[PDB]
Amino acid sequence: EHVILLNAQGVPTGTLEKYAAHTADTRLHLAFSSWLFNAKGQLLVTRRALSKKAWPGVWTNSVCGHPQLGESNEDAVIRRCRYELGVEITPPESIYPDFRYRATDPSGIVENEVCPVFAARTTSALQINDDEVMDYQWCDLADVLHGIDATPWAFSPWMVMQATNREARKRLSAFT
Ligand SMILES: [Mn+2]
Fold this sequence. Notes:
alpha+beta, three-stranded mixed β-sheet, 176 residues, 5 helices, binds manganese (II) ion, metal-binding, Nucleoside Triphosphate Pyrophosphohydrolase, monomer
């Protein structure tokens, strides 16, 4: 696994090995986030495994990751959903294509990402990958947004930042 590097124009300049790109001085790179909803309209919230290098043991939106060379964003979502959660999904839909953030985790590991956001619905049962996900929950969207708004430090910084953008929250609500 690698990440795709980007300049200030969102133009790709190359590539680096996933683990090694993520340091105290992480260079701008490409990621994605998806918000997954079941047939009841509940959002899947997941807790990252204790073994993750960056934000281990942290609650977060359904699935995030790094698209690889030659793979669309959508296919990255679909593949990471099969890999982390053992689940099939409807075609990912853009909700926040221009999302970009920088943040620092309790060990000083920085994420610095152009991170388009998607929503999809699950169409099969979860089969949890314990190396990635230590816990999850199905929740009402409005409950999660109140949590995020009250105690943001309880969630990952990309989850919070995505959820707090007005256009993004409105599209996520409409999707449910
Ligand atoms: Mn990253």
